[model samples]
Target: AAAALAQPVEWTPCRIPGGALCGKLAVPVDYDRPDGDVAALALIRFPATGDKIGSLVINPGGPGESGIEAALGVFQTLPKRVHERFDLVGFDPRGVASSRPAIWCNSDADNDRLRAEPQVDYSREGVAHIENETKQFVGRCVDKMGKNFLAHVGTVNVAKDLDAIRAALGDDKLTYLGYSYGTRIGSAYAEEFPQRVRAMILDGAVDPNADPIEAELRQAKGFQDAFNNYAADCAKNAGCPLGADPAKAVEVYHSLVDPLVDPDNPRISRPARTKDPRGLSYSDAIVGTIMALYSPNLWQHLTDGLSELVDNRGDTLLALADMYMRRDSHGRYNNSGDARVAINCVDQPPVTDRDKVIDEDRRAREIAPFMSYGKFTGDAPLGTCAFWPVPPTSQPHAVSAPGLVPTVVVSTTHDPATPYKAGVDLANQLRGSLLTFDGTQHTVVFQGDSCIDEYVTAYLIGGTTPPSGAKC
Candidate 1:
């Protein structure tokens, strides 16, 4: 293992404008064949505090979102004392932003076309639109994104990169803080190097127990549940502009979708889910709700957006949609979606037999009413990935932390991205880890709670792990 290689690759450090210093930590492309080739990790570091404790490494949510920016942005909110005592580090996982050999496909135009197609109604009109949309969209991505990154872009490769970073830092046991998709990075690390883990915090915990079937389908359910939470909350807050009845507001919202689907009228032409000129799915509405449910702090915005739409003003929701798409000021979108499918298609090879398409769609809708049509068809933008060059990693490995140093796991009661149950599931699966159901989204140490912050900091600084099954 390059992990044991005496001579670590020479690392180069650079600086980001208006941000912290960045670097490339080099490691072998294949951990199993460390003497053979090399891959570089996108490294970032914030200055360690006086009496610095230890470095905390992370990959932020997207599985594709660069952890460099997120860590820099988030640590600003970490417990003041802890921030003064630990160095914060994060990196772009292989094939994500800033990571060498980034995974990419399509363009704003191509993505626009894919998202423009309707998700529901199999009438000739709808099917014709979706068919054309899918074909052209897939063609563009394959043609433009000719596949340098399709291979070597999975959770396992990312784990190898972490080992390399650990070697470069000369840390005996790496400390980690992973959120959303980042949890997979932490999980993979534990699975591969149990003894090398000093402490890890998996916030908004993703479940390694999940296959794509359960992952995508169950994630859709999470979106649904999150919307239920939002709706219920909107109804109770006197300050909520959406009024006292969330069901009614949602009905008004849905009722408006069909009548307002008219693209001929400039007033209704704008999309509510993306920059794609196409109409949106009911799933888009429900799925979108999950993105905002992360913090009750966003509830005011949700109610304001919903109330604006109730009066036939949909621009607020449209703004939210564009936000969901996450295009930068440069008009370039993040590659999270691209990276997700590249890894997903390979890791969990779809039942590609054409004979199974319709049945799969049928079963999918049955499995998840909101995601069935899109997943079976094009819920996300993966139809294009079938043409991408990368092959998914075939074998699967479970992330069960056994005989490992204790780690702290945080779960938000309402985190739609990494559902609370998943945190519980991961904590149980990870031997000796302490699980804290923070009763809030994303937890406190990272953002939300003083109690959680103190507990995590205490564990890290005092060299004490919370008792198993500890709660905050």
Candidate 2:
């Protein structure tokens, strides 16, 4: 493992327009068994224009998001000063895009078939049906990708891979910028190698203290708040599909979308019309709504999507859903969705107890009524992870890095996925500074906000921590 870490990456010109270097690095799939199978991680680097400080590795959210793509996107928007100093580097984590042995449990057609199936409600029969479906889904994954590979794709192993990447980059200490689930990887790395950290920025943080269920609940509330904000904005417009009253927006939303999952009809009682052969499914509609809620910039699109839904068309909404799922127009699907499930299932313990699952579902509905359907029936489907073949390798706990430098934790006040409080909590846990963005979005760093970018660039270039309770 040490020898592998010491090896330098052989960089080559990227096929992309940006004059970036692209390469691959091999790391053990399971660090505990270094002699076992390895994963070839795909990496991309945008070289510095001026004197280079070192490599600044980044990970964009998604437990399964492609870092290589993220780097390409960020390279166009990130501040020039930061780009002048540090080489911007991004990598596709194990089982992700461009990585070897990617998690391909089902083909595009298989996924389409599964998605086309009628969505179930919270009824006892619905729960039972979903459980059987999940069992089949898990069985398919186990049959396609062995449990040995699935069990090792958690964050613990990813942190190890980060250290290996750091060594391969010829950096004695690591400088990292992580967003959303990427924050989980950064925190894990800090705990595992406290002394090896130079400077780190964890934005849109996932609380280390929250278990899977709690995390879900927090996110539900976060999304609910974001939706409320959007509804408030929409109410000001006379053309809002939700009508002029902001208070009754949730009811209007339900009235519009709930019919897609009408239990009585069971065959998409009222499917949203689309030019494509397949109509919009309830799952896709919900996914598209959630995806749009991530940033306020997409709020108008959400408004347009809902308006189209009223007109019996779902093109805009379906496109948003397709983007979220990484599905292409040609019916091809990336491995991101598969890798997300595999990584999350192995990273945290799943809720298997039926009664607990029901309780959580009820609570989730209460917190996020915008996402609920009919009345709660005391029965709800268990999550996909409940049927995972391997046990979770990590549990929720407060992460501590005793000797690590003062890092920065950025949190947006109304982030839909990672709640704002999680960032404050992570800052406390890391004994680092908390930079607050009083906005409604997931992650804001390096997104053209001069205040946030200036603070981050200073911290990344020189280990200067922001003033306490810094708000942008």
Candidate 3:
């Protein structure tokens, strides 16, 4: 196993811009069964332009986001000093894009059928309907990909794969940058192989100790706070759809979107206009709105989409939703969503206490009224993960890397998805320096912030730790 993992990666020129190299790394599907089934991970590299240091592996989160694609974008946008010093390497974890045996539970037709189904409230019948739908979805995954393959896609396995990739790249110690859910992977690697870490930057960190239900609630609150910030900014402009008073923005937002999910009058429900004849559904509208909340940069588009909702048009909003769903113009969905669920289900134990789940749902809506609609009932349906075929391989726990290098943790104050405090917890866990970006956004490192870029680049290049409690 060690010899196989240490073999050099055979690279070939990628068919993308900027002279990048693409390759594949063969790894065990189950590390416990080293002689068992093997999977291929797709890899891409932007070779250093100047004096080469070592490979700097990167992951852009999603638990399912294509690191290969992220590398291409980061290569073009990050400072030239980074490009000169390190080889920017990105890889699609097993069952993700360009990797063998990709996880795909839903076909395009399946997605269309699911989307065409009527939106449901929290009524008993609605809860039952959601439960059955989720069960069927999980059934499809098991039927298509089998339980064995799905069971092995968790973060623990991916962390092991990262070590293999590091060895193949000839880097004695791993240098990594992980964002959002990717922080889980980086933290896991640091915990499992502490001494092997050269330097790491975990941006938009996930709290390893958070209860699954509590984590969701925190994320809901984060989104609500971000929306409030957007509302305050929008109120400064004339004719804001949310009205001139930021205090009443949530009420105004509900007034505009509530009709879409009105259970009493399906015929009067307003579906937004899209280039596609089918337009945007109520669920799509909700997803689109949350998608836009991920970054402040998309606030204008969110406002524009909200404005169009007043006119019963939804092109902009539908487009934003499509981006989140990874549905291309041809209506073909990518495997990212499938891989995300498969990985996440096995990574964390599903919250199975029905009453507790229902209570959390009620609290989530109370905290984030912008995400609320329809009736709140004690019979709220359990999430899709509750029906997941694979039992969790790992549980939430605090990470410890005693002998690891002084890593950098970059966190944004108002990141809607991964809250800023999670980053603080992670930094404390690793005993690493926290580099704070006092702004609204997700994963701010190397995103045109001179302060952040300088701190991160210095650490990655020269192993310089940022000052304790540094703020950009």
Model 2 residue 463 distance off true place after TM-score fit, in angstroms: 1.4
Which ranking of candidates, highest lDDT first? 2, 3, 1
Q: What is the C-alpha lDDT of each candidate?
A: 0.62, 0.87, 0.86
TM-score of each: 0.81, 0.97, 0.97
lDDT of 1 by residue, 1-472 (tens): 1232545534345544223556676555566676755555677777566786667776777656778778777766777666677777878877777766566766776655444433554444554555566566545545654443455677777787787677676677788888877777888888888888888888777776676555655665665566666667777877555457865654544554544345343122334443433434333444344456666676666666666545555444544554666655455677776667666655545544433445445554654342233224432222434444456664544566667877777777656667788887787778646556644354445665666777778777775777766777
Top-lDDT candidate index: 2
lDDT of 3 by residue, 1-472 (tens): 2223445678899978668898888898889897888888889988889998899999999977899988888887778888898899999988998888788898888786666543546677778888888999999999999899999999999999999999888889999999999999999999999989999999999988899998899999999998999999999998898899999999888776666654575323456676787676777777888888887789899898889888878788888888998889898898888889998999989988999988998898799988877557677889889999889988889987788889988999998899999999999999999999988777888788899999998999889998887899
Pick the winner on TM-score between candidates 1 and 2.
2
Model 1: CA > 4 A from native:
1-19, 30-38, 122-148, 238-243, 247-249, 262-288, 351-390, 394-397, 438-444
CA lDDT of 376 in candidate 3? Answer: 76
Error of 2 at 294 (Å): 0.4
Q: Report residue 167 deviation for candidate 2 (angstroms).
A: 1.0
Better of 1 and 3 by lDDT: 3
**Candidate 1 vs candidate 2, lDDT winner:** 2
Q: List the residue pairs that clash in candidate 2.
A: none
Q: Kindly give the number of clashing pairs for every candidate.
A: 6, 0, 1
